[PDB]
Write a protein that binds this DNA or RNA. Structure first.
Ligand SMILES: [Mn+2]
Ligand SMILES: [Mn+2]
Lengths: 732, 197, 121, 70
DNA sequence: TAGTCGGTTATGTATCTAGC
DNA sequence: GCTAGATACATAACCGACTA
């Protein structure tokens, strides 16, 4: 029983199956539905396809949905559980494969995959496929080998192309597709089909109490002043993305760290605190809107105390507007005429109770549409869900009074057969398409959008239009004249402008020897192998025991990041690694790498990193160091460092282990016994030559008397410690 | 006791080396930090001005000294090409490369290189526990593929190190958790000459 | 009429995920009468209780729990003219349930109990 | 036995895909008229926020802003 | 709140014991 | 004489606990 297609989806599916391309839907308009249609289309053992950007929950949901549908040869997930020697078989079976990215890059580069039998690839969240990504690397490899299969890319989120960083044409080139399909919400087909199956919706605007209005205005004015100051100090930060109405949203945090992280090496003292104050003020706005009053009072008092101790909130917390905020909060909880209390509750709870009363009265007589129908209350986070449950069960007065007292100083089995109310924490950021899942597990007659976002509105629209004859009623609770409303409206406007720009861009777009590098297997969680391969150097992954990259037969590069370098020097690993590299390779190299999104700066006492570096390079005179600002420069240096030398090879670099022989001129001693000797107590850097030259092996060292040990060592304490260590016993 | 060559009089780091005595003297390397430790200097802007200076210095230096450091100062905003070319030249001419971003760092490098002439490497070794059982189980781990579990198994089975050196290959192999490979490695580690013949 | 219902087991409420298999090409679900519904859970009474047992003795012991009865090993059962096939998947979403007719909290089992039925000869 | 992936030709695979899609396009859904829901007292005692989510109305620029947030 | 240290996690690979 | 499963470890990147 294949999945029936909505009226507007058949045209889309036919277009995408005719030619490869990138599909951009309006937010929430069922991208998982299209992905699943293709998954069910390609479940045969005579063709294998791969799906790229999927979370485990989505994978499990798709697999189980196909299983319930009555399909054979379900898709498989490939992880560390199926080892390399056993992976090839599951590749040759066929069907849809949900492999991760590390596994896939390794298997593509090492040619452990029927890369001539792959028929195509399905990419989820194609707006994430930017250059310098693992999935871009996988696409590059597959297209270099196959050149015959298909590539179909899907995405919600037409906004993610609207930011000045990512470009739709650049991504469409990264995906090798060369064709753009746009299906917005105002498209004629989708709007025409959706306007016939509308759900009955009632939206309530609840007005906030005067003190809530006062606190919100005080917070907004403080935030406006702080933003003005932060902009004034630094004149580059004048682009419209950081306006006031764009700085009340959740996604604002990321954008600020886009502009200020590069310049955070030279940033001032003050402008390192105004950003914090922005963070706390946005947190305060969210706290005021979402949770109750005593929690707000507690948070404000915590801020006051912390400023009393460390002096953190100096830029505010003493102005007149902050004192207005404080007196308003304390007027919301306290009342001083030895104490007395008021404890008002925000109107959203009362509106929700009235809605629930109407629902219960309806269900009392609801018999015409079968039984009663169930209610689903979608909240914004787990804290709000728990608060709603506590409020509903206990009541307003007991809940508030117990919260105040806590925070401050004081039948065995059967069918339910009754309507249920289920509280669901939306968590819009994590996985937007979770409501749909709940909407299918428990089918509600009424949905109460307590905290609403655009994607959930579209999802409820689709869930209703997917069942032609069953109705539902959507309550839509929102605060009138608050930040909630403003965030919703800005989201609407941004989406519309992004789609218009995309359509205009497409409309204007229609008019137009061999060298290798043996790379360790642990290095593929990094951008460097991809950048090396882009130039035209092939990679041969292998699990080396000495070093990371083998540019030539005698050159072993060990890559170290700055934090890694400091940690390794402090621990003791780098010394052993250097001794091994110098023992087996003639021209070892240590490559110290910096991060581009960080200053190009490495920032007497033994604790000083320069001291350790100087000591290390003084002890290993043949060690060479390379400095590189970013992996993009490192790859070019790697190319320039092998201009005429011969290439390396695996199966001998992999054979450089402990049991192999060292360099012809590196050490006159056996590495094994020498390393074993230096660890037992009683032998130091200087004396070891004497015990090594006067004696043959460890066995002879065991048979010696303490007099000869005192003779050779020249120290009595060292000799006695040796004699105790060698000839002691466990039971003693 | 640093014999600074008098060619770099106009260098703002000579004012930054205070924790050590330095005197002028006509020697070929730029700063002679004791026996078998020389140095040169290069400010990246000056190198940009003349791309022939440092190549000539390195070519004419010779191959006398064991360690020949080359510490440079970064001042320009685009060092990637200069850093690449310097790294290539240093690799091809057998001298290490050290980066300092300011005169104080270069002076500190000078002081550290002079003061550490015979400093032992005890600073960089790993902190090793002095507990007797821990020391023994750490010394027996230095052979490949042998872990702490069989280390303690052999500890309980044998007790003393003496007969552990005395016991033969097969006698080692009989113990649980220790097959032919571990037995071969351990026997060869114990009964091999310190010197290579 | 066939719709997804909820069963109670002591302090827990399991939300069963009922599915209906069509009668050949021409689909219909009306035959799954309410009289054919309730006794169904009796057929699957014991199993659910068994599931509600181990979970508790895992939760008291402070470690995660694994299915031991899942899609790889379903439960084929025979009733009065209908097939039964029941899995036990994970949900990963923290639901909360309040009975409005008594406005009292009721814990939800954190596992989705999907059962599929079909008519027989 | 060798797996079917290497055995079956590609053109037969394309023919099977065409059969599958031609089957997919044909599962047309049944249509029934939605029974009415009882009227809500809350409505009787202008849902422009929801009905603006269609992004298809006039919705001049000033309609995307709220007065109290000035 | 931000720098630093330490634990956790995902993939691989020898190596031994039990069973063939 | 030849093969399957399980223990210990290696390693680099990432997240949380501390802490100033
Ligand atoms: Mn490594
Ligand atoms: Mn490394």
């Amino acid at each position: 029983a294949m999945a029936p297609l909505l009226e507007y989806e058949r045209q889309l599916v036919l277009e995408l199956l005719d030619t490869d391309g990138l599909v951009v839907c309006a937010r929430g308009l069922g991208a998982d539905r299209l992905l699943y249609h293709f998954l069910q289309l390609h479940c045969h053992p005579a063709c294998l396809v791969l799906v790229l950007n999927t979370q485990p929950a989505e994978e499990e949901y798709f697999i189980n949905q196909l299983k319930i549908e009555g399909v054979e040869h379900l898709p498989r997930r490939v992880t560390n559980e199926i080892t390399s020697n056993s992976r090839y078989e599951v590749y040759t079976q066929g069907g849809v494969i949900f492999a991760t990215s590390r596994i896939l890059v390794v298997d593509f580069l090492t040619d452990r995959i029927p890369s001539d039998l792959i028929t195509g690839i399905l990419v989820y969240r194609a707006h994430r496929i930017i250059e310098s990504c693992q999935e871009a690397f996988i696409l590059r490899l597959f297209r270099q080998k196959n050149k015959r299969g298909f590539i179909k890319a899907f995405t919600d989120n037409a906004v993610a192309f609207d930011t000045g960083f990512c470009h739709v044409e650049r991504v469409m080139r990264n995906l090798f597709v060369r064709k753009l399909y746009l299906w917005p919400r105002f498209h004629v087909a989708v709007n025409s089909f959706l306007e016939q199956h509308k759900p009955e919706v009632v939206e309530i605007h609840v007005s906030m109490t005067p003190t809530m209005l006062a606190i919100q205005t005080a917070i907004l004015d403080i935030l406006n002043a702080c933003l003005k100051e932060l902009k004034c100090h630094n004149p580059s930060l004048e682009v419209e993305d950081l306006s006031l109405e764009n700085a009340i949203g959740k996604p604002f945090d990321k954008t600020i760290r886009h502009y200020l992280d590069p310049l955070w090496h030279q940033l001032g003292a003050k402008t390192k605190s105004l950003v914090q104050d922005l963070k706390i003020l946005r947190t305060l706005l969210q706290y005021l809107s979402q949770y109750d009053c005593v929690t707000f009072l507690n948070l404000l008092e915590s801020l006051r105390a912390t400023e009393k101790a460390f002096g953190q909130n100096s830029g505010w917390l003493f102005l007149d507007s902050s004192t207005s905020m404080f007196i308003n909060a304390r007027a919301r909880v306290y009342h001083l005429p030895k104490k007395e209390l008021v404890l008002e509750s925000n109107p959203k709870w009362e509106a929700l109770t009235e809605v629930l009363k109407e629902i219960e009265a309806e269900n009392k007589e609801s018999e015409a549409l079968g039984g009663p129908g169930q209610v689903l209350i979608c909240a914004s986070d787990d804290r709000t869900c728990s608060q709603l449950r506590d409020y509903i069960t206990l009541g307003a007065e007991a809940f508030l009074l117990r919260l105040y007292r806590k925070t401050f100083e004081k039948a065995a089995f059967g069918i339910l057969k009754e309507p249920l109310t289920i509280i669901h924490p939306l968590l819009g950021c994590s996985d937007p398409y979770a409501l749909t899942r709940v909407l299918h597990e428990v089918e509600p007659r009424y949905v109460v959008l307590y905290d609403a976002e655009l994607t959930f509105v579209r999802q409820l629209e689709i869930y209703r239009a997917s069942r032609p004859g069953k109705p539902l009623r959507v309550y839509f609770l929102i605060y009138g004249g608050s930040t909630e409303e403003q965030r919703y409206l800005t989201a609407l406007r941004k989406e519309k402008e992004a789609f218009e720009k995309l359509i205009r861009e497409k409309a204007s777009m229609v008019v137009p020897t061999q060298q290798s590098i043996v790379v360790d297997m642990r290095e593929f969680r990094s951008e460097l192998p991809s950048l090396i391969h882009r130039r035209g150097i092939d990679i041969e992954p292998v699990t080396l025991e000495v070093g990371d990259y083998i540019l030539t037969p005698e050159m072993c590069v060990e890559r170290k990041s700055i934090s890694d370098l400091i940690g390794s020097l402090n621990n003791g690993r780098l010394y052993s690694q250097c001794i091994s590299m110098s023992r087996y390779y003639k021209r070892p190299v240590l490559l110290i790498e910096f991060d581009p999104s960080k200053p190009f700066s490495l920032t007497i006492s033994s604790n000083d990193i320069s001291s350790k570096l100087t000591l290390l390079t003084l002890h290993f005179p043949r060690l060479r160091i390379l400095w590189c600002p970013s992996p993009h420069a490192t790859a070019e240096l790697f190319e320039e460092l092998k201009q005429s030398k011969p290439q390396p090879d695996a199966a001998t670099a992999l054979a450089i282990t402990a049991d192999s022989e060292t360099l012809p001129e590196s050490e006159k001693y056996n590495p094994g016994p020498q390393d074993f000797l230096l660890k037992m107590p009683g032998v130091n850097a200087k004396n070891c030559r004497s015990l090594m030259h006067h004696v043959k092996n460890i066995a002879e060292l065991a048979a010696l008397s303490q007099d000869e040990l005192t003779s050779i060592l020249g120290n009595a304490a060292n000799a006695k410690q040796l004699y105790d260590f060698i000839h002691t016993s466990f039971a003693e | 006791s640093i014999i600074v060559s008098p060619r770099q009089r106009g260098n703002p780091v000579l004012k930054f080396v205070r924790n050590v005595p330095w005197e002028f003297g006509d020697v070929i390397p730029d700063y002679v930090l004791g026996q078998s430790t020389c140095a040169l200097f290069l400010s990246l802007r000056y190198h940009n001005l003349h791309p022939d200076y440092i190549h000539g210095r390195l070519q004419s230096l010779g191959k006398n000294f064991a360690l020949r450091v080359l510490l440079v100062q970064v001042d320009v905003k685009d060092p990637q090409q200069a850093l690449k070319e310097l790294a290539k030249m240093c690799i091809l001419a057998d001298c290490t490369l050290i980066l300092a971003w300011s005169p104080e760092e270069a002076g500190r490098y000078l002081e550290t290189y002079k003061a550490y002439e015979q400093k032992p490497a005890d600073l960089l070794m790993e902190k090793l526990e002095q507990d007797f059982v821990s020391r023994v189980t750490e010394c027996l781990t230095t052979v490949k593929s042998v872990n702490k579990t069989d280390s303690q198994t052999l500890l309980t089975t044998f007790g003393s190190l003496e007969q552990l050196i005395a016991a033969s290959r097969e006698d080692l192999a009989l113990c649980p958790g220790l097959g032919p490979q571990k037995a071969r490695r351990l026997f060869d580690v114990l009964h091999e000459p310190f010197l290579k013949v | 009429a066939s719709k997804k219902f909820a069963v109670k087991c002591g302090n827990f409420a399991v939300l069963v995920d009922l599915h209906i298999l069509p009668q050949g090409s021409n689909k219909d679900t009306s035959w799954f009468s309410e009289q054919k519904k309730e006794e169904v859970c009796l057929l699957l009474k014991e199993t659910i209780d068994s599931r509600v047992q181990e979970y508790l003795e895992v939760r008291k012991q402070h470690r995660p729990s694994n299915a031991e009865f899942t899609r790889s090993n379903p439960l084929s059962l025979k009733g009065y003219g209908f097939q039964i096939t029941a899995y036990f998947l994970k949900r990963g979403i923290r639901l909360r349930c309040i009975r409005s007719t008594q406005n009292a909290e009721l814990c939800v089992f954190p596992d989705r109990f999907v059962v599929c039925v079909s008519q027989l000869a | 036995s060798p797996p079917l992936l290497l055995v079956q030709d590609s053109e037969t695979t394309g023919r099977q895909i065409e059969d599958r899609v031609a089957l997919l396009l044909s599962e047309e859904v049944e249509l029934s008229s939605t029974p009415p829901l009882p009227a809500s007292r809350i409505l009787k005692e202008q849902s422009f926020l929801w009905e603006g989510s269609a992004l298809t109305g006039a919705w001049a620029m000033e309609d995307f802003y709220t007065a109290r947030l000035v």
